[PDB]
Amino acid sequence: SINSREVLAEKVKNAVNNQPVTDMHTHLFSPNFGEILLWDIDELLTYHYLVAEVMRWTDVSIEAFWAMSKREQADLIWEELFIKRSPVSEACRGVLTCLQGLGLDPATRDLQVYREYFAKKTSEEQVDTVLQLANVSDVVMTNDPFDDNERISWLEGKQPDSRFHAALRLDPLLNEYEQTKHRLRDWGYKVNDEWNEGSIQEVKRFLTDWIERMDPVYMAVSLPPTFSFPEESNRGRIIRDCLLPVAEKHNIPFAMMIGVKKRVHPALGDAGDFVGKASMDGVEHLLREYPNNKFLVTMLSRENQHELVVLARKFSNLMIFGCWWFMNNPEIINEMTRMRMEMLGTSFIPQHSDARVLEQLIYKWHHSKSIIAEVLIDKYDDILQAGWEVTEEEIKRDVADLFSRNFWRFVGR
Amino acid sequence: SINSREVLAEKVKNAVNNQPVTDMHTHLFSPNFGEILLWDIDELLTYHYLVAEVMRWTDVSIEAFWAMSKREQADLIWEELFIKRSPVSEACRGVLTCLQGLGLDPATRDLQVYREYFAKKTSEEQVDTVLQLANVSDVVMTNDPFDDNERISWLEGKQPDSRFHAALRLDPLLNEYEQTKHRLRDWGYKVNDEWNEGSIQEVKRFLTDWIERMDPVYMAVSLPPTFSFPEESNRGRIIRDCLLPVAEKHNIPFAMMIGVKKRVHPALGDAGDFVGKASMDGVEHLLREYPNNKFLVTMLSRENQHELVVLARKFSNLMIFGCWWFMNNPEIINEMTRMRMEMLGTSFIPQHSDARVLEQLIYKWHHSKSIIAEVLIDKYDDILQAGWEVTEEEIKRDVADLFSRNFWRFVGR
Amino acid sequence: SINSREVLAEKVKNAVNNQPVTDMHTHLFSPNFGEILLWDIDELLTYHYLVAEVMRWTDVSIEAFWAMSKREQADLIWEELFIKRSPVSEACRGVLTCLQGLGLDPATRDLQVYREYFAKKTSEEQVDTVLQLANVSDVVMTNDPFDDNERISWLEGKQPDSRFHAALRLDPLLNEYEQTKHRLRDWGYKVNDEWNEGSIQEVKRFLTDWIERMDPVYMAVSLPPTFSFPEESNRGRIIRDCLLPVAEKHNIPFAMMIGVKKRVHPALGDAGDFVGKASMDGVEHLLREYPNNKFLVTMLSRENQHELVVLARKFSNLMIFGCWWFMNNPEIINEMTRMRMEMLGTSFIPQHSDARVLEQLIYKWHHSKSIIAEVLIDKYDDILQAGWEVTEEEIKRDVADLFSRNFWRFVGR
Amino acid sequence: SINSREVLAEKVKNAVNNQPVTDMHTHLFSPNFGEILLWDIDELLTYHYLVAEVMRWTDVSIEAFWAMSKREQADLIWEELFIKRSPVSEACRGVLTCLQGLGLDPATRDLQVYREYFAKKTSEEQVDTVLQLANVSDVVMTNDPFDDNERISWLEGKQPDSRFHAALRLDPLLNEYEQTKHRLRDWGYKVNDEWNEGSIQEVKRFLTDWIERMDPVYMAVSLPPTFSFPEESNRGRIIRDCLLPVAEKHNIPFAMMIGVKKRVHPALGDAGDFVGKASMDGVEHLLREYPNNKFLVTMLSRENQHELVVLARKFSNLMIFGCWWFMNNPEIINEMTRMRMEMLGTSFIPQHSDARVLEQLIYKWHHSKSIIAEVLIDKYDDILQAGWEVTEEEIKRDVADLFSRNFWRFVGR
Ligand SMILES: O=C(O)[C@@H](O)C(O)[C@H](O)C(=O)O
Ligand SMILES: O=C(O)[C@@H](O)C(O)[C@H](O)C(=O)O
Ligand SMILES: O=C(O)[C@@H](O)C(O)[C@H](O)C(=O)O
Ligand SMILES: O=C(O)[C@@H](O)C(O)[C@H](O)C(=O)O
Ligand SMILES: [Cl-]
Ligand code: NA
Ligand SMILES: [Zn+2]
Ligand SMILES: [Zn+2]
Ligand SMILES: [Zn+2]
Ligand SMILES: [Zn+2]
């Protein structure tokens, strides 16, 4: 038996640390796709999360910033966020966790020496190194066929190795149909200006074609805080008449990341998005009215978190996942994971990395695993006190479900 | 006087665990009322909180589940939530706490043996046992005159034990007046199709009649997130012209449990209710415009909790109570109780059990007391460090107010 | 070298304790303004925060309360909140902390003796004593030219000493222009009936004249949950045509304190204000459309805190500050500071005292600094463990930024 | 590098735990030697250290105790020292650590179940199991040619396996020559009544004969607190004319375990020995006057420990080792190890187990490694603080010296 919390803590920490992770949502790509897979210290430092932060300190105008080279940008952020002020924020701390994990020494602050480490490795080598360090066995990518560069790679035979899984990202189709319908036509999908049977079948064809070419684990889309459903709009009709039925047929879950308010600050680029609390009505309707469809949902507002958990108690076809973007900070990750486990036990997916830069897998999982471990230790200790006798194998089992099995079990694969 | 956190913690925990509890809201009934009072391990396992949870895991269809016998359902839940996955959720932990409390040993996981304990015992007995273990001196029931079985009971003179108190629940009357008014007719209450003096006075008779028959400590109603007041609706009118004036006459408080969205998932039965954030406008209005009325309030949305505390700072005729339903989880209980004590001192009612099954009193109060004691220890220790000295007597006094006195003083009994 | 959390806790606690504080928002006044500057134990006990709290207990009518003398009220509150029940609330705790900090001993509960301390001392002496004990180097006041007593003081030549700075509060002008315009004309400002060039120019003259006279660090206003911008109202036009242009010319930041619902309980006086969640739309617009203007923002609703931080991530012309009013409680201060640091690093102002009574400076900063120090320890420890070198000089630098430099840096002074 | 004490601690603990141990003094025997190798829970419970302790509580006479069967003695000790009083003593704590280490569960206190674990294993199997758990690579036995049983095993040609090493124990020869000389004669060693050339040569012959048969890593003897040298006694002459000369020729060190006063309480058997402070004169003389001889020393009196460390500072032919018997308690092990490291760096052997029962290897080493690890963390931290940069490889090296290499390097094998 586990006679003390101290022994329980060590055992839980070991289980969590040893458990290979399936990162069900990232912005990483199989290395064979080429330069689109971003990596190295300069990429880590230029992560848009750090761009927003540096802009709060530097005198360098945003225009000037974008005009600088990748190396110059990295130098500026290093100086502004690490040298001039202690790198205490979550994103800055993450850069340090990566460096340390790669065997580099943050104590020297020798940026040139860190760069040299990367300059002598191939992408294939760095992916092997990182996946081993972060103990990540499977990476789910975000594949947007509407992006010209991504589309051409797929059309020209590019396929990911077994460690990388595809996910059909449909933001342009679902949120900008008025513009996107023209491109569908240019690609041979005869969508009409009237939402008729022809338009429905062609949008379905598009989805089916890409499902066949990508073999996605799920279809996804990020939605605004004003998201509602049903709705007489292109989004409402495409979801209802095309997406859901196609998803039901192939038994592919629909991933909705709700709460992002796009481009409140255009100049910042990828760092210019904001957040807003959403109504749960649209989500509630979808789960109740489409019982044969699977939905993976993560929300951006802190104020949506608790009710999202309650909604998960209502419908089994709802699998909530991760602590997304602005929620991906220790204070939030902790409260979210606790409310989730208290109302759902182990029937959820606590985290994903959303890694845009390869090395981030190291800090994203290291930082989150330590928090999730502390939650588990409290929960296990609580039942041990109630007289329950939890075993190490059961612990390893629960941990496997949280970090990998629940996802694969849900996507039905 | 106490001059160390060590001794302080000793005395606080002692006062808290020794303090006789008055559960000012439950779904239990004096044992003389018969079977309506649920109890035993099978009832604990089939609590709807656990029904919602098992459905997220089990392959069994909700139809087949409802088709199963009580025993069969319990066995399914025990297997799905306790054996196949660690029973870490608050609801599952609660069952274990209950068993351990009764002397049973969760370490064995011998569901059969646990079952035998209850068999060889009677309702009258188990109530004495449970009330002894949970150290609860008074239990406030939820008495719905609109329920047939329950109604006939009060009609036949059935009086509840002196340790069980009555609460007049009016959900059907205030939320479904249109369908309810017809039943009011059948009971000699001549309500008119229109809201005239005739209808107003008959609704009052209905209320006054039951107040006499039940001698309730308060009248209660659960409301939706969209609750508004004033409001040109039956609820708005019935509350304004009947409930309020009557309540003020008998000097009886009005308990409003706001935030529940009923039947979002009909098939789940009692486990099918959801939650939503409410506007404080209505409660603000009621408290201000009706100073001679006493209001007991509790809300279901995590996002309503802080402003409710602030509202309690504004109006003394407002007494906030407990961490209701989806709020009844350690993470929320802790933050709620701390915000409350920081802005209200000891002028609020920290908790109620909402027990639907007798034994639940054990875990409900055990889990809550441990959290409440911790909060008290920190707050006492903070003033202790400022030089203030607290006596054990003052501690028992304070603990008395929180777990029993504030309620009786508020209702005026 | 700082090579452990233990050593770090020491250095951080020391740094925070020794860092002189610039309180960028208070209701204190330079001693040479006389009466208006409140102080002593009777004033502390009658802080409106404690009034609201006593009214939740004392059966003394609010009318009677206001009818009695300062000392009578102080005696009642002390009796009701310190003797009748342990003074565990934040506001009561504060009273005790101020006493101890002054040398008085709360263990004795000798109110009479505490009073003798203040009786034999001048105002000039008490400010010197308090500013020293609270380690506060600069105090920003709230100067409302619409208050007859304050306005006449400025008009007659009253100037604050080196330690007190002015802040031009404009609530009457922006939120009550209909009644206020009549007073502007009485003072020579020819604002017309319709919002035309003449009205715009005179309102500007009004602001400019007062900017010359007070030389304020910033212009301020408290706003309701329903605040919006742009908006066709006097507030919206005054801000758009008058406030912003003037603020930009003199490079004076605009301080918006959003979320207060005034007078939901008029009888309580200053203690009768409530809170409500606001939309971020207005703030988002102001920041994006007026890049040459600087904004200081703090919000009253707990539910606005997280999204306000994200907004700060989008705009560098936004500087968020403090845990205002109902947010100024440990539980909230803690969660707010951690969310801010995690997403903003050190680019924010964690706190302000909002002191109405001089002595409060002692407890406001002592209670807050302890929480902020603990947050810092956690954040520094996280990067230390990640391999980062943290020097005592860098800690002092960061601490100095948070408690003083960020403010002066933002205001351009 | 090692940036923090927390990381240093993890690395030191790991190095220490992972380092295979050479236990240079035990009372264990290679399994092929027979039943002389004691093992199992009953042997653990009847360890003489526990016999002395039980006699302080039990009403059972020492005579009756010796009359009981081994199983009965074990039952009594378990009841008296573990059940009737908490097993907080070091020797009792040790029994528990062994049980836990073997996978058994101390929480059940099921002595019968623990016994079942041992009945199904063979000596050779338990040796493999224990050496693995305790991470002991090499064991030094105590081989007494004067014990009939053991002597026969050697005369038969039995050899210990590669994991076990011999040490020629000479207590009978050196301390009881008058009686022992008669046995030397029966064995062919023609020693005379007078200490002449013949006696000296036969004694030497006896030593050489056994050194050739055992190939001991050292010759050893336990001495009384009155030990002196030079000395005109059989011990002084045998050491001067036989032991030392032989030891030099074979380059074999002489181990002296000084401070034991034998049989102060005869009836207690092996548990009847006491302790006394010794003069350092004889050891000082031996070290200085016999520079070509190597000496391994350990002393029993707490009051001899510091001066022994200082003596090691004077002579390189002196190797001090372990915390012997009455010194083998946490409080002493810690103060000893700290004085030794502070005055000798890593030039000493911190510990040996003195295990009489096989399983004790588990607790002796587990208990000592944790203390030693703590001392090392402190010392490394102090030099890290002085700017030194210790590497993980240097730590492993230092650890190997302390737990293994220093010994083998000193005995030149
Ligand atoms: O980096 C991010 O998290 C965002 O910029 C987006 O990639 C977001 O995660 C999304 O998937 O839409
Ligand atoms: O179990 C519960 O708490 C709910 O299902 C209801 O009983 C709720 O508490 C209510 O009283 O409306
Ligand atoms: O005491 C308070 O904080 C309030 O009553 C107001 O002074 C508020 O701080 C404001 O500045 O409007
Ligand atoms: O168990 C013991 O440590 C003693 O009884 C002796 O074995 C002593 O260690 C010795 O070697 O003489
Ligand atoms: Cl909200
Ligand atoms: Na919290
Ligand atoms: Zn993403
Ligand atoms: Zn209820
Ligand atoms: Zn203020
Ligand atoms: Zn020995």
b or e along C13-48 (b: 16 or more beta carbons within 10 Å of the residue's beta carbon)? bebbeebebbbbbbbbbbbebeebbbbbbbbbbbbe
> What is the whole-number distance in angstroms between the Cα of residue A207 and the centre of ligand 3?
56
Residue of A3, A106, A107 with shortest CB distance to D107:
A3
Terminal C-alpha separation, chain C = 35
Residue C222 Cβ < 6 Å to ligand 3: yes
* Measured distance CA(D32)–CA(D161) in Å, rounded: 8
User: What phi, psi does D255 have (nearest 5°)?
Assistant: -95, 125
| Ligand 2 touching residue B354 (CB < 6 A) | yes
C-alpha span between A221 and A225 (Å, rounded) = 13
3-state per-residue secondary structure call for chain B: CECCHHHHHHHHHHHHHHCCEEECCCCCCCHHHCCCCECCHHHHHCCHHHHHHHHCCCCCCHHHHHHCCHHHHHHHHHHHHHHCCCCCCHHHHHHHHHHHHCCCCHHHCCHHHHHHHHHCCCHHHHHHHHHHHCCEEEEECCECCCCHHHHHHHHCCCCCCCCEECCEECHHHHHCHHHHHHHHHHCCCCCCCCCCHHHHHHHHHHHHHHHHHHCCCCEEEEECCCCCCCCCCHHHHHHHHHHHHHHHHCCCCEEEEECEECCCCHHHHHHHCEECCCCCHHHHHHHHHCCCCCEEEEECCHHHHHHHHHHHHHCCCEEEECCCHHHCCHHHHHHHHHHHHHHHCCCCECCCCCCCECCHHHHHHHHHHHHHHHHHHHHHHHHHCCCCCECHHHHHHHHHHHHHHHHHHHHCC
Ligand 1 midpoint to CA A302 (Å) = 16
Torsion angle, alpha carbons of D297, D299, D303, D304, to 10? -20
Q: Which of C303, C313, C345 sits opposite A303 (nearest CB)?
A: C303
Strands D136-140, D21-23: parallel, antiparallel or unpaired by DSSP?
parallel
Let me know: does C312 contact C304? Beta carbons within 8 Å. Answer: no
Mutate to test the pocket of ligand 1, among A23, A24, A25, A27 (most ligand atoms within 8 A of CB): A27
Q: Which residue of A has its CA nearest to B277?
A: A307
Amino acid making up residue D304: N
The tokens describing D279, both together, are 């003069």
Backbone φ/ψ region at C133: left (φ over 0), alpha (ψ -120 to 50), beta: alpha
CA dist A89 and A81 (Å) reads 9
The reply, when asked if residue A331 is annotated as ligand binding, is yes
Q: Distance between CA A329 and CA C345 in Å, rounded?
A: 12
Q: Are C89 and B343 in contact (CB under 8 A)?
A: yes
- Residue A185: CB atoms within 10 A of its CB come to 13
- Could you tell me if B126 and B118 are in contact, meaning their C-beta atoms sit under 8 angstroms apart? yes
Q: How many residues does chain D have?
A: 413
Q: Does residue B144 line the site of ligand 2, with CB under 6 A?
A: no
Chain D partners within 8 Å of C384 (Cβ): 3-4
Give the side-chain half-sphere CA count within 13 A for B14: 10
Q: Which residue of D has its CA nearest to C1?
A: D385
Q: Give every CB contact of residue C360 below 8 A, 6+ residues apart in sequence.
A: C44, C47, C94, C98, C353
B323/A contact by beta carbon, under 8 A? no
In sequence order, the β-bridge partners of residue D319 are D296
Q: How far apart are CA D5 and CA D13, in angstroms?
A: 12
Q: Is C27 annotated as a binding residue?
A: yes
The Cα–Cα gap between C317 and C293 comes to 7
Contact list in A for residue C335 (CB cut-off 8 A) is 331
Ligand 4 neighbourhood includes D222 CB (under 6 angstroms): yes
For residue C240, the 8-state DSSP code is: I
Strand partners, A299: A258
What is the rounded distance in angstroms from the CA atom of residue D282 to the CA atom of residue C412? 82
Query: By the 8 A CB rule, do D141 and D166 touch?
Result: yes
| Joined tokens for residue D242 | 């036989």
Q: Which amino acid is at C284?
A: E
Tokens of C90: 């934040």
- Separation CA D12–CA B166 (nearest Å): 65
H or E element at residue C136: strand C136-140
Option in A1, A3, A107 nearest D1 (CB) = A107
Cα distance between residue B167 and residue B216, in whole Å: 5
B61 → chain A, closest CA residue: A316
Q: Where are the alpha helices (DSSP H) in A102-170?
A: 111-119, 123-133, 148-155
- Going by CA atoms, what residue is nearest to atom 5 of ligand 4? D270
Return the half-sphere exposure (C-beta side, CA atoms, 13 A cut-off) of residue C100.
19
Q: Which domains does chain B have, with CATH numbers?
A: 1-37+120-143+328-413 (no CATH), 38-119 (1.10.2020.10), 144-327 (no CATH)
Angstrom distance (rounded) from CA A350 to CA A330: 13
Structure tokens at B383: 């003033």
Residues listed for chain A: 413
Instruction: Give the H/E segment covering residue A165.
Output: strand A164-165
Residue nearest atom 11 in ligand 2 by C-alpha distance: B222
- Cα atoms in the 13 Å half-sphere on the side-chain side of C39: 27
What CA–CA distance (Å, rounded) separates A209 from A188? 12
Structure tokens at A123: 């992408």
Residue given tokens 């309020």 in the structure block: B244
Q: Is the peptide bond before A291 cis (omega within 30 degrees of 0)?
A: no
Give the end-to-end CA distance of chain D in Å, rounded to a whole number. 35
Rg (CA), chain D: 22
Helix (H, G, I), strand (E, B) or coil at C225: coil
Residue A326 CA to residue C179 CA, distance in Å, equals 43
Q: How large is the C-alpha radius of gyration of chain C?
A: 22
User: Hey, which residues does B413 pair with through a beta bridge?
Assistant: none
CA-nearest of D8, D1, D2, D3 to D378 is D8
**What string of H, E and C letters represents the secondary structure of chain D?**
CCCCHHHHHHHHHHHHHHCCEEECCCCCCCHHHCCCCECCHHHHHCCHHHHHHHCCCCCCCHHHHHHCCHHHHHHHHHHHHHHCCCCCCHHHHHHHHHHHHCCCCHHHCCHHHHHHHHHCCCHHHHHHHHHHHCCEEEEECCECCCCHHHHHHHHCCCCCCCCEECCEECHHHHHCHHHHHHHHHHCCCCCCCCCCHHHHHHHHHHHHHHHHHHCCCCEEEEECCCCCCCCCCHHHHHHHHHHHHHHHHCCCCEEEEECEECCCCHHHHHHCCEECCCCCHHHHHHHHHCCCCCEEEEECCHHHHHHHHHHHHHCCCEEEECCCHHHCCHHHHHHHHHHHHHHHCCCCECCCCCCCECCHHHHHHHHHHHHHHHHHHHHHHHHHHCCCCCCHHHHHHHHHHHHHHHHHHHCCC
Q: Which residue is listed with tokens 């049973």? A: B104
Ligand approaching nearest to the C-alpha of A38: 1
Ligand 3, atom 12, residue with closest C-alpha: C222
Which residue is associated with the tokens 């990381």? D7
Q: Number of H helices and number of E strands within chain A? A: 20, 10
**What ligand 4 atom has the least distance to the C-alpha of D47?**
1
Q: Any chain A CB within 8 A of the CB of B301? A: yes
Encoded tokens for A75: 């130098």
What angle (nearest 5°) sits at the alpha carbon of residue B204, between those of residues B203 and B206? 65
Give the 3-state secondary structure of residue C256: strand
Residue entry with tokens 């199904």: D120
| Chain D residues closer than 8 Å to A105 by CB | 1
The answer to whether residue C80 neighbours chain B at the CB level (below 8 Å) is: no
Dist. CA D44–CA A317, nearest whole Å: 58
- C168-169 and C219-223: which strand pairing? parallel
Of C3, C387, C389, the CB nearest to D5: C3
What is the C-alpha separation between C195 and C192, in angstroms, rounded? 7
Q: Which helix (H) or strand (E) holds A168?
A: strand A168-169
Element (H, E) at A146: none
D280, D281, D287, D290 alpha-carbon torsion, rounded to 10°: -150
d(CA B38, CA B356): 7
Q: How far is the CA of B194 from the centre of ligand 3 (A)?
A: 48
Centre of ligand 7 to C-alpha A219, Å, is 13
- Tokens coding B380: 């006492």
Neighbours of D88 (CB within 10 A): 8
Q: What is the spatial order of strands in the sheet that B164-165 belongs to? A: B21-23, B136-140, B164-165
**Is B87 within 8 Å of A388 when comparing Cβ atoms?**
yes
| Distance separating alpha carbons of residues B3 and B389, to the nearest angstrom | 7
Distance, C-alpha A353 to centroid of its chain: 5
Measured CA to CA, the distance from residue B355 to residue B29 in angstroms comes to 10
Burial of A56 (0-12, 13-18, 19+ CB in 10 A): buried
- The CA B261 to ligand 5 mean position distance, Å, reads 16
Q: Is B354 marked as a binding-site residue?
A: yes
DSSP state of A178: H
Q: Read off the tokens for C150.
A: 């304050």
Residue B410's contacts (CB-CB under 8 Å, 6 or more residues apart) are B253, B294, B296, B319, B349
Residues 6+ apart with CB under 8 A from D383: D390
Q: Whole-angstrom Cα distance, residue D195 to residue D191?
A: 8
Q: Specify the 3-state DSSP secondary structure of A256.
A: strand
**Contact between C391 and C8 (Cβ < 8 Å):** no
- Minimal Cα–Cα distance from A91 to chain C, Å? 8
Which of C57, C265, C332 is the best mutation test for B, with the most CBs of B within 10 A?
A: C265
Q: CA B192 to CA A363: how far, in whole Å?
A: 69
Alpha-carbon distances, residue C407 vs B177, C22, C304, C308, C352 (angstroms):
58, 8, 22, 18, 11
Task: Tell me which residue of C112, C80, C86, C89 sits closest to C99, measured CA to CA.
Answer: C112
